[PDB]
Amino acid sequence: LVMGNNNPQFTSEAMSEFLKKSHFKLGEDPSLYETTT
Amino acid sequence: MREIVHIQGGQCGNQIGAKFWEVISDEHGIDPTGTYHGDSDLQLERINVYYNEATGGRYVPRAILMDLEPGTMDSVRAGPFGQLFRPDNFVFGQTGAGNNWAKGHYTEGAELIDSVLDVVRKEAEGCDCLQGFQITHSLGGGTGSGMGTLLISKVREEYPDRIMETFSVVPSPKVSDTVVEPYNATLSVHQLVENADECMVIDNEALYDICFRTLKLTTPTYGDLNHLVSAAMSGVTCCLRFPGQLNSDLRKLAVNLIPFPRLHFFMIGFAPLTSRGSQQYRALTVPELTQQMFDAKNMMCAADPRHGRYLTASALFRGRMSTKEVDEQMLNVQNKNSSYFVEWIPNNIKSSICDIPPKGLKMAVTFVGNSTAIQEMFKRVAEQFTAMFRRKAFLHWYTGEGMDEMEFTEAESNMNDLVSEYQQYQDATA
Numbered sequence: 211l212v213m214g215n216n217n218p219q220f221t222s223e224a225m226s227e228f229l230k231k232s233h234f235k236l237g238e239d240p241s242l243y244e245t246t247t
Numbered sequence: 248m249r250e251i252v253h254i255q256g257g258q259c260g261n262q263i264g265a266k267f268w269e270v271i272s273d274e275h276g277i278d279p280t281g282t283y284h285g286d287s288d289l290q291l292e293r294i295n296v297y298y299n300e301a302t303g304g305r306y307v308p309r310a311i312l313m314d315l316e317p318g319t320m321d322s323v324r325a326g327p328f329g330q331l332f333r334p335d336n337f338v339f340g341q342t343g344a345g346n347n348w349a350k351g352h353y354t355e356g357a358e359l360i361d362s363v364l365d366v367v368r369k370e371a372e373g374c375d376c377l378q379g380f381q382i383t384h385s386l387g388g389g390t391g392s393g394m395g396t397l398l399i400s401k402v403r404e405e406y407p408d409r410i411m412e413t414f415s416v417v418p419s420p421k422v423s424d425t426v427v428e429p430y431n432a433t434l435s436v437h438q439l440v441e442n443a444d445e446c447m448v449i450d451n452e453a454l455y456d457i458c459f460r461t462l463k464l465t466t467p468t469y470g471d472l473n474h475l476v477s478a479a480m481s482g483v484t485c486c487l488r489f490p491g492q493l494n495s496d497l498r499k500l501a502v503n504l505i506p507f508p509r510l511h512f513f514m515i516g517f518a519p520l521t522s523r524g525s526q527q528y529r530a531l532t533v534p535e536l537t538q539q540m541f542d543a544k545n546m547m548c549a550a551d552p553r554h555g556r557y558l559t560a561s562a563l564f565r566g567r568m569s570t571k572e573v574d575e576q577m578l579n580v581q582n583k584n585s586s587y588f589v590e591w592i593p594n595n596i597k598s599s600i601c602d603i604p605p606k607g608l609k610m611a612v613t614f615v616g617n618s619t620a621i622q623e624m625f626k627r628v629a630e631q632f633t634a635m636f637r638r639k640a641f642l643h644w645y646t647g648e649g650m651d652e653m654e655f656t657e658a659e660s661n662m663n664d665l666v667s668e669y670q671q672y673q674d675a676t677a
C-alpha cells in the first residue's frame with residue numbers, strides 16, 4: 211500500500227518579525243486702556 | 248496686599264487651573280518664560296495680587312498643585328505656560344484614591360496632606376495681608392472631593408476670618424461619568440456647607456448646551472469648557488485688580504449676596520457670548536448685555552431659575568459705561584420680572600463697574616445669582632443617593648476603611664435639612 215505523496219510539510223505556528231488639545235474661541239479688538247479718571 | 252492664593256485639586260481642578268493661569272498671564276502680559284512684556288503701566292500696579300517676585304526680574308504664580316497621581320501634573324508641566332509654576336509647589340501621592348471619597352479623605356489624605364498644609368502656610372503667610380483662598384475642584388471625583396474638602400476644613404480652622412471661595416463642579420445624571428457620584432457628592436456637600444464661605448456650581452451639561460447653542464461650534468472640547476470657566480473666574484476678581492467707577496471685592500460680594508449663613512451656593516454666567524459668524528451682527532450695549540445676562544439658558548447650571556425666586560442678584564460690569572444706564576436697566580428688569588424676585592428684599596441687585604475690559608472685548612459682564620431653583624439639584628442628588636443606599640450598593644468599599652452607615656444617615660439628614668430650609672424662603676410672604 212502507498213501511504214501518500216506529500217513529501218515534507220514541517221511548519222509550526224509562527225508569527226513573523228514584521229490634535230484636539232487647544233481651544234477654538236474668542237474675538238479680538240484693539241486694547242482700550244486709560245480709565246475714566 | 249489683599250492678595251488671594253490659588254489651590255487646585257484633582258484632575259478636574261488641575262485642568263481648570265492650567266487654563267486659568269494661562270488666561271491670567273495673557274491678561275497681565277506675562278510671557279511663558281515669566282518676563283513682563285506688557286503695553287501699559289496699569290498692568291503692573293496690581294500684579295502682586297496673583298504673582299510673586301523672584302530674582303532676575305521674573306514673576307511666579309502663587310499656586311499650589313496637589314493631587315494623588317503624578318500623571319495629570321506631568322501632563323500640565325510640559326504644556327504651554329507650564330514653566331511658570333514653582334517646582335517645589337508640586338505635591339503628589341503614589342497610589343491615588345480610585346474615585347473613593349473614603350480613600351481621599353481618610354487613608355491617603357491624612358498621610359499626604361501635611362506637606363500641602365506646610366506649603367499653603369508658607370505661601371499664605373508670606374504675603375503682605377491675605378485676602379482669602381480660592382479652590383477649584385469637582386465633587387464627582389474621589390481624591391478631589393475628599394482631600395480638597397479636608398484641606399478646606401483645616402485651612403478654615405487655621406484662618407477663621409479669611410474669605411474662602413470654591414468653584415465646584417457638580418455631577419449631573421443626564422451626562423454621568425461615575426457610578427459612585429451620589430455618595431461622594433453628598434459627603435462633599437455635607438462637609439462643604441459647614442465650612443466654605445462661598446461656593447459656586449458648574450455643570451458640564453450646561454457647558455455643552457452653551458457651546459452647542461450659542462457659540463454654534465460643531466465639536467467643543469474640555470479646552471473650550473475650561474476657557475469659559477477661566478473667563479468666569481477672572482470676571483469675579485477683575486475689580487480687585489483694576490480701578491473702576493464702583494470698586495467691589497469678594498468680601499463685599501459675599502456680604503451683599505448671602506442673606507443667611509448656610510445659603511452660600513451660587514450659580515454664575517457670562518456675557519457676551521456670540522458665534523464667529525454673528526459676532527459683528529450684534530451691538531455691544533448695556534441692554535443687550537443685561538438681557539443676555541438674565542437669559543435663563545445662558546446660566547452655567549441645569550437648574551432653571553424660572554422655577555424659583557432670586558433671593559439676590561449680582562452683576563459685575565467691565566468697561567467704560569454710564570452708571571445711570573446701568574441702574575436704569577437693573578430697575579427695569581427688577582420691575583418687569585416682579586414674579587421671579589422675592590418681595591421682602593427691595594432693590595435686590597448689586598452692580599459694579601470696572602474700567603478695564605477683558606482682552607479682545609470692549610464690554611463684558613460677570614453675573615452671580617442666588618435663586619431658590621438650585622434645590623432641584625439637591626433633591627435629585629438626594630433621590631439618587633437614597634435609591635442607591637436603600638439596597639446598600641457599593642457600600643462595602645466605603646465602609647471597609649473607617650466609615651459606618653451612621654455618617655451616611657447623618658449626611659442624608661443634613662442634606663434634607665438644607666433642602667427644606669432653602670425651599671422655606673421660596674414661598675415666604677411679607
Ligand SMILES: Nc1nc2c(ncn2[C@@H]2O[C@H](COP(=O)(O)OP(=O)(O)O)[C@@H](O)[C@H]2O)c(=O)[nH]1
Pocket residue numbers: 256257258259262263346385387388389390391392416418423424425451469470472473
Ligand atoms: N469642566 C471640566 N470638567 C472636567 C474636566 N476633566 C474632567 N472633568 C469632570 O470631572 C469628573 C471626573 O473627575 P475626576 O477626574 O475623577 O476628579 P479626581 O478624582 O479628583 O481626579 C468628570 O465627571 C468630568 O465631567 C475638564 O477638563 N473640564
